[PDB]
Design a protein around this ligand. Structure first.
Ligand SMILES: Cc1c(C#N)n[nH]c1-c1cc(F)c2c(c1)C(C)(C)C(=O)N2
Ligand SMILES: Cc1c(C#N)n[nH]c1-c1cc(F)c2c(c1)C(C)(C)C(=O)N2
Lengths: 546, 546
């Protein structure tokens, strides 16, 4: 029975193959057929290319050797290489054109999810070209999805040499019959077949995957669209910043580029952005996913006033100051969305751009108490239930698994009644003790939240709703302002509290506002519709946030 | 007696003053004198500019109001504003031209170092211009050096209103006679004088500082050149990455821009780069100052093999992978310098550029044991003393304060004998029990190292020297290579072990090598000559690392 799958890089996980460019150049330059491929492999195991692949020399040292073999091959064939003939330009173009073969990576992803040990085995080089970063980026993206990456230049062995295959088996800790090996070079497949491995000669991806699914007995072709890459908490870089003597803020950090600070809502975590973090970092951004004050590994002081918008905003500014960041793009959801609008209003110099999921920007009404305003709409009753210190804490901390299983459900999986929460005596009065696991979350994801909330519970998080008068007084100071920095409002069709129509007047205050809208999306936006959130945010960042 | 100093921003801590540009524009455009200054202050406390300064409106909302006042003022004066008249272009230019008034900041730095509470009090605006980042950067740089920053647009009060001064005194927690207040606007100084504060009208910086030193009795003018800004460990962002099940790496992180990974030597810390971190972040880089494996908050496994170059290098690559960084520039000192050369040799695709302080690149000799090679040079005897497990640990951990006070000394303060360490029975056999504090370090800086080394001691750090055979075998694999990526070698005139002449053959292996050289500099480069290290590294990063 198969339990390991090995994939080649060039022509398998990455296309067009760097090899096939030798043939295209020959055709474009009307050079003899195979001339460039012949000079490339000149000398066989004793040649320049084999030394390169074994790590003996770098790609920049190899370039002039390849030039010399091209001269030699042209001399024998009685032909002339054109004037501006440059191996460097040829390879720079070839490497740059090579992209991840998405359906092949997806097949590798499915096998690993099904218990297979996955590996990349490749004949590669030590790239010291001025433009080496392109390749480093590709290898970085691919490698994360596999258990092992074996590079010829790092192990000092090359395919089709028999030793690299015995090295492969030792690393996999598997016998040959337990391994599927995919390669686009028949010669490099031969030693694996001879050892007893299942071998697939990759020409076109589709046929290779048909062979792959037939041999593993796992559906790899025609499968439903996959969810974006998530986060394993133990594999992330965790950051800690003391913003004031008793207050430390924790964050998860991934990527390089403009700083994007993600601000979760109630009662969530940095982990609510798990599907966005890898995607935004891959799109060219340095993602800082916060544990907001009161949550996870961030400090959770008991005092109500520690959670008013003015203090929360000041601490996020100090957070930027200590990290040495003059600005970040601020993206928030729910309570996080409310904070990001106020960051844009009070600290525009520190906000590169602002985006909110579900949370509209509604200006304070100076002629009405915020208590009055909340009472007017019956969908906001849960917020009145949250007012009395200790009440909501007791019900929410009673059974954490039940709390998170009951909350984190799709728009059609509701087990909760939002009207008359106070009157009924709680959110879970007529809700199950052991709710079914929502289609949106796994047991493992729920247990992560349970573990996070064991530290500080619900006091700090609930205190975010306990500053209505303080927040209204502060917001009133901003009534003569407009938000004029880049801004994005994302509405969720099925959020029954933060309804899309509540955002209808935002253009009066944010004239240049851009929008996104997600159909069949409930309140828990990021995990409800991650692909669509990713598409909207990446499109908007690339156009408005640089 | 004075105990607090307050400085204005425009015309005091920052020059040329944004205000004086109104006069320059009038002169360049041959407009009536004071026309632009008159339209700027139009309406006084009821005017557009006062609303802006109080935070009622943003700078982008203010721009068209100022345009309207300029039209009104030109109409009354019977003059015409030219065609391409734009207040935005005028202010964009003015804000951009404004730079930190270095001698004023230095005077503020000296007073704070001498016990004064320092503050910035400014009439400023909420900047939402597309180019607001320039100003955010300036405010960020300045604010870090003061106890308080009071902005008119944030407090809803403006100078010369009496309330902002009572607000200032409350924040300082000082009576008026204890305060020196510096301002370039006589009108804004008046309420502070009336309250009983010492007031300085700032016209030219030099005279203002003369008045400042006369009143405080502290030398502020003609003072010796200051050391660069250092780091307070409790104010930094601390990062943690698990590179393998038993190995976590800690780092300090500051700035935005290309990633610069700083790698200390033996027996040091992330804190060895304290004078470089703020400087490199200010120069436009995202600094990652490591605690190398075996040190500080990083894991320190006991096994010798855990510290060979191959494993150390692989873990730094994984560190990049987990942070989502395809590359970083690698800067190392001593053992860190040795690691960075090997990163450039084995992982060039992951190394944007490489720089070493003191540590030359010397290729392995395949015809000689590294044990043999070390014995040949008497200055390397300390490395033979480090070979036997437990010996050096016992002497170095015996008294931590003594260890660090004895080590961290300038080239002329040596209390250590480097010849015949083994024969004499240790590094400190004929060295003081209570050494004098070197001119390079404070007691506080020494106690930081003492505290760091209390966690894991010297085993892990010493293990870095216990892999000579393993390292030599690995280095031999690289003998046919050259380092062809951007590289910088920094020599220290007075390093008696890592002598500048040991670097003389490096061009044979790194043909495009750039150099720096520091006169009168011992082994502890970063703290011996921080200004010169900063100058060399920033010049080289800006030319070769982007
Ligand atoms: C129940 C609850 C708690 C708790 N404890 N925190 N936040 C919310 C909540 C907030 C919302 F905005 C929306 C919803 C729930 C539903 C009803 C799913 C919706 O459609 N919107
Ligand atoms: C003594 C010691 C220890 C310890 N325990 N670690 N490292 C060093 C050391 C290394 C060097 F390279 C140089 C020096 C000291 C001096 C003599 C200051 C120099 O000039 N170079």
């Amino acid at each position: 029975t198969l339990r390991a799958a090995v994939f080649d890089l060039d022509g398998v996980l990455a296309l067009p193959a760097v090899f096939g460019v030798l043939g295209r150049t020959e055709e474009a330059l009307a050079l003899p057929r195979g001339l460039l491929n012949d000079a490339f492999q000149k000398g066989g195991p004793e040649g320049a290319t084999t030394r390169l692949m074994k790590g003996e020399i770098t790609l920049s040292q190899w370039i002039p050797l390849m030039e010399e073999n091209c001269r030699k091959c042209s001399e024998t064939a009685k032909v002339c290489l054109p004037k501006n003939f440059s191996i460097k330009e040829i390879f720079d173009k070839a490497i740059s054109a090579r992209k991840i073969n998405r359906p092949m990576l997806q097949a590798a992803l499915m096998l690993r999810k099904k218990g297979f040990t996955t590996a990349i085995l490749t004949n590669t080089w030590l790239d010291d070209r001025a433009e080496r970063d392109g390749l480093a980026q590709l290898m970085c993206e691919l490698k994360m999805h596999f258990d092992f990456l074996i590079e010829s230049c790092q192990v000092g062995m090359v395919k089709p040499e028999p030793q690299i295959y015995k090295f492969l088996l030792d690393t996999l800790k598997a016998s040959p019959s337990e391994v599927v090996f995919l390669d686009d070079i028949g010669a490099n497949l031969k030693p694996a077949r001879d050892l007893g491995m299942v071998t697939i000669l990759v020409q076109d991806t589709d046929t290779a995957l048909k062979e792959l699914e037939k041999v593993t007995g796992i559906q790899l072709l025609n499968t439903p669209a996959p969810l974006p890459t998530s986060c394993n908490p133990s594999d992330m870089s965790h950051g800690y910043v003391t913003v004031k003597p008793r207050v430390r803020l924790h964050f998860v950090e991934l990527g390089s580029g403009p700083a994007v600070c993600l601000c979760h809502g109630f009662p969530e975590s940095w982990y609510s952005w798990r599907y966005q973090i890898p995607a935004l970092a891959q799109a060219g951004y340095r993602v800082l996913a916060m544990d907001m004050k009161g949550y996870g590994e961030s400090s959770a002081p008991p005092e109500i006033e520690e959670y008013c918008m003015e203090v929360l905003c000041k601490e996020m500014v100090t957070f930027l100051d200590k990290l040495g960041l003059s600005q970040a793009v601020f993206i928030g959801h729910d309570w996080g969305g409310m904070l990001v609008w106020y960051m844009a209003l009070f600290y525009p110099e520190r906000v590169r751009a602002v985006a909110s999921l579900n949370t509209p920007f509604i200006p304070a009404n100076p002629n009405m108490s915020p208590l009055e305003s909340i009472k007017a709409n019956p969908v906001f009753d849960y917020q009145l239930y949250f007012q009395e210190p200790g009440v909501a804490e007791a019900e929410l901390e009673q059974n954490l698994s039940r709390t998170f299983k009951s909350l984190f459900r799709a728009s059609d999986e509701s087990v909760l009644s939002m009207h008359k929460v106070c009157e009924a005596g709680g959110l879970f009065v007529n809700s199950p003790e052991e709710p079914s696991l929502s289609r949106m979350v796994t047991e493992e994801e729920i247990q992560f939240y349970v573990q996070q909330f064991k530290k500080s519970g619900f006091r700090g998080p609930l205190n975010w709703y306990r500053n209505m008068e303080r927040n209204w007084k502060w917001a009133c100071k901003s009534l003569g302002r407009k938000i004029l920095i880049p801004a994005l409002m994302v509405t969720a069709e099925k959020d029954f509290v933060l309804v899309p129509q509540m955002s209808q007047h935002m253009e009066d205050w944010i004239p240049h506002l851009k929008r996104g809208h997600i159909e069949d999306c409930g309140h828990w936006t990021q995990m409800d519709k991650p692909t669509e959130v990713n598409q909207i945010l990446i499109k908007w960042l690339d156009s408005d946030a640089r």
